[PDB]
Assembly symmetry: D2
Homo-oligomer: 331 residues x 4
């Protein structure tokens, strides 16, 4: 007899059906960052990667697999057939025409418009119940594309929106005050880009409202000039791409914090793109970031933040700008 | 006044003094993979990145800093100036030429010895009390070189060694036997290269020796062809490098593992690379990976792994090829 | 016009069903030590407690509940009626009339079968696809009982067995040798306690047999008295209980280790009790502890440990006494 | 010819100074819950236990030690001699004369001051540079006591205080809103106990002030009756004591978290007790809770919460009664 069977008495069969599968679509720098972080937070027991390049795909898979000793994720699978997606509770989409030196969240749409039409319909054919987390830019419109195509009630199609923008914000806030970002609370909402809006009313430490102590905080009259930390956040990715062509780690850490909420029913509040049709005016079927309540069904709840009239404005604007495009969708 | 002064009341002044600082030298794929693993296991309170590529170094530091929120390591620094290395408990060196497709690791010795002639002085100058962990290849030869240039006790100069080769061995073992690599045991000693030695003696699950249950284990007269699983771990690097152009994920977890045993002082046993003079009939200063005991002081104890005669010859000459290069080494 | 509706706008009318529920039956010391171990390892998104003394049951629930901020398990629930153990993937039994400051585990089986005939059917009534971790003492006969009552296939009625016994054996080894228990390997088997086999072979570090080194190990012939560590691994329950009046922390860490292997599908090996009918001279319907591949379907494979002369005796001697007791059981 | 010397060659002998040691004083329910939460977060390389009951100690130490296989804390030491507290970085005081189903957390201050006159001097002797955490109740007064008997500066004497008063307040805030305690923000400050202060303006989700939406909030005419959340918090302890006899689980999780911010230099914001003389109109040496900033030197910074002289009264009246008792302690 073979050595395996000389050493190991069998007892069953099936053992394949993964119970917490997670799938990354795209294995550029972002997808791998997502992957390496989903893998070290012990979120998924199966991890499936999909992309079109088949050398880069096999090799990345091989490399993580070689570390399984140092992990608690016991199956890692790759391939350009979406059949390995099969039964993923959550699917992360990062793939498509991404970025330049200089180009910003407004030089693709039509590129990525079309790529998506293969990816999405196949994520639904082997993961028909799954949850859809859109990362690749222009992320608010691509959540539109992802939603209609797959069908899916709006709660199960989440875009990653301003989740990282509020993080980079809470980092610059903490660096200014000497407090850990965990203890600085600040929200950045809207469409992820230059038309994000930092809601300064909610900026606080230990409960105390910074806007209250510093009434001119945010207005271009500000002594301390905080409106610029919101400009560091808009141009962080520009000044990190300028130093090394791309961003990766931070999105991966932010994304894995989102998957954490979903995969564990934390019902924490994150700012992510979902369908605000109704809220803040907005009568169109548009997507953009708002304090959501993420769980094993994704966006079950929204936190109806009270905006000022100029804030509610800049939202509707961007919320037009967008639908001025999506009425024109080839899909 | 200032906002930060309406809000926070200072009470203690002074201090940076790093209590558990780690320093990674080199921010290539390997480096940033260690830095990312080491950041996610909460091994450092300060983490420093040093390299010669200014903009890439800066940009990688920023990418990580933008993730502080999802981390628990409160300070991350970088620069060209080893001054930011100062007072480190552990210094992880990864800089230097890495293997092209097909290239051996010993073919990088001369190019890297030059780079160590620069790097080690500056490291010692700022953290003479540290432990040195060598990742760059050829890792056994560069561990030795780092010993001569540092003049650190042999126990504080550790080689990355065959910790990853044994870990790749245990992945392949486990996949043959449908077992998690944690529960498969078996050690790869020697050099981190083509003359590594697999030790079937100690191959076992649940304490059950595999060479007695199958007395043709390893050897060519092997119909199950187990000697090819050690051939797969030798050809591991080449094939990843073939596929994606470099390895990074597995070794960064392999390194953070070593780091875990040193920072927390576990006295775990790893096959790091150390000085073996006067053992297995070797009498010159050749560093080789034997199972060691790592902790707060680095290596402190060598497990004497009882080898065959072939296992002991394999090792001696994997050692004697190693000394060949090492003797003619000029610095 | 509530304030919650003024802040939250819902989308998800309905839903729940927990995807990683764990129930613990009995909130004595052991159970609550299980519960806290399970909780800080974030293995479950819903922890359910059930006992019959309800007051102590609700107080422990609140004590955990209040620590919600520090756990990643959003739903902790308990009660008297098992309708809240519903949808457990894993259920852990600590019930029964507990031993007292020094009672052996073979004077008790009578009353226990009859509580189990209330509990075990209620567990399946609400969580039909769950796995039965039996912790109650004595583990081997009581696992047989749980199995015989639920009608579950043997792969789903796991006994704590000699797991913590091997854990303690490994802690005693490493403290002898001066090594972390992780780098010391050893395997105690059989009926849990006294009739426990210390398989002196498996005793290895870095794979090199402690026996074939000093071949009077685990013998009366031993200068270094090593047959005694086994004796301490049997008299440990005693010496703790004799001092603090029950054992808790070590057992809950052990249960959380198996739980993790089951809930995270790790397929690691552990010395646990399941049916061993057909091996070593057992074709009774006994339960003993052997190395077992634990996965999402409980035991999946047995590790056919090659046992010696004297030891294969001790395994079945016990096994037929057990069968004595178990052939009479009135249920 | 020892089994050890044959299996291991030794390079270093000496050693010791553990880098992140933690001493817990008092192995009651609270102490042991502290010790177990600190062990399952890997904050310490060494944990010491000190107490008075010689046997009950060795049992708790030996139970944990048998769990060494499931922890990354290589050393656990117990003893009634505080020479085992040697070189701690954090020292957690849980010991004292506590209460029943009556005794108010304010009147016994003197019996405890007596006990602290034994502990504190021995603690500060063998760890002159430790951080001192007081959990024992009346935690605010006994913190002031520990401060005097040590001569330590303000920043290294810290009282447990309202840390769990706020954990519980936020957990209940999650009850009403269906949000994880992590995304519910609010502070309970003042004197630990019945006269703590719920800062209602603070209270927010996602940054939106619940006090601005629901202007009654925490008032008497408030139809949702948000006043009884505070009442629930203030009485929670005693209600849990009724049911199970004592509290434990939530404190240890409370203390683990504090211990992490200090041991990892987070600079996170916590409501711990510190010297408040000079703010809100207090001119006596009294400690009560405000949001301090916890680091590697303990308390480095205070948050000056905008109270409103009703709130600010409560604090004053708390200081005055506090200094009342503090003035009549013989020590």
């Amino acid at each position: 007899a073979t050595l395996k069977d000389q050493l190991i008495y069998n007892l069953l069969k099936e053992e394949q059906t993964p119970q917490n599968k997670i799938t990354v679509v795209g294995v550029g720098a972002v997808g791998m960052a997502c992957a390496i972080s989903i893998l070290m937070k012990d979120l998924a027991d199966e991890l499936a990667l999909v992309d079109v390049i088949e050398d880069k795909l096999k090799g990345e898979m091989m490399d993580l697999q070689h570390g399984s000793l140092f992990l608690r994720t016991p199956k890692i699978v790759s391939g350009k057939d979406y059949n390995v997606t099969a039964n993923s509770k959550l699917v992360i989409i990062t793939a498509g025409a991404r970025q330049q030196e200089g180009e910003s969240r407004l030089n693709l749409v039509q590129r990525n418009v079309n790529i998506f039409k293969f990816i999405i319909p196949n994520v639904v054919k082997y993961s028909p119940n799954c949850k859809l987390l859109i990362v690749s830019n222009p992320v608010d419109i691509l959540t539109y594309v992802a939603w209609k195509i797959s069908g899916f009630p709006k709660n199960r199609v989440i875009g990653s929106g301003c989740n990282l923008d509020s993080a980079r914000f809470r980092y610059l806030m903490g660096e200014r005050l000497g407090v850990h970002p965990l203890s600085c609370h600040g929200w950045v909402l809207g469409e992820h880009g230059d038309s994000s809006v930092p809601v300064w009313s909610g900026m606080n430490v230990a409960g105390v409202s910074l806007k209250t102590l510093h009434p001119d905080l945010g207005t271009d009259k500000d002594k301390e000039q905080w409106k610029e930390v919101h400009k560091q956040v808009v141009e962080s990715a520009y000044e990190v791409i300028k130093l090394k062509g791309y961003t990766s780690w931070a999105i991966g850490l932010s994304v894995a914090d989102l998957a954490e909420s979903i995969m564990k029913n934390l019902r924490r509040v994150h700012p992510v793109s979902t369908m605000i049709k109704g809220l803040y005016g907005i009568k169109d079927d548009v997507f953009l970031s708002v304090p959501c309540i993420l769980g094993q069904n994704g966006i079950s709840d929204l936190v109806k933040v009270t905006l000022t009239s100029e804030e509610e404005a800049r939202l509707k604007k961007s919320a037009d700008t967008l639908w001025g495009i999506q009425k024109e969708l080839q899909f």
